[PDB]
Amino acid sequence: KETAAAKFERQHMDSSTSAASSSNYCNQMMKSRNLTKDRCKPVNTFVHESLADVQAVCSQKNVACKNGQTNCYQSYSTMSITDCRETGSSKYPNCAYKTTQANKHIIVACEGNPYVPVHFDASV
User: What residue ranges are annotated as transmembrane?
Assistant: First the structure.
């Protein structure tokens, strides 16, 4: 009963802030968004934009997903994002992450009625 959409919002939406406040952003939020529960999730991106703005990407530039499906969409304009990559070590259950900030075009897979993001495919 956790939806694809809700999982996407949870794993990748942080409308709260406008960027990664510190360099302890990833460590703190990977934990709070349940991405360190069963293992250390190796990589995750967070997006600092309204849910409406990210949702509207589902009708922006249609592009191929990395898997060969056709339901991926690239944002016309750049967005504030935060990449979390696990440091060399870092051992579960003390998951440690490099927190990288940038302004990039996001790529998301959208599905459903209504048609919303369910997967973060890439940033460029």
Answer: none
Range of the domain at 90: 1-124
Tell me whether residue 66 is annotated as binding: yes
Active site residues: 12, 119
Q: How far is CA 30 from CA 64, 73, 74, 93, 98, in A?
A: 28, 25, 24, 12, 11
Tokens representing residue 15 in the block:
């409308």
Q: Is 93 annotated as a binding residue?
A: no
C-alpha 72/C-alpha 103 separation (Å) is 19
Whether 42 contacts 86, CB under 8 Å: yes
* Three-state SS at 47: strand
Is 1 assigned to a binding site?
Answer: no
| Experimental technique | X-ray
- Count of domains observed in the chain: 1
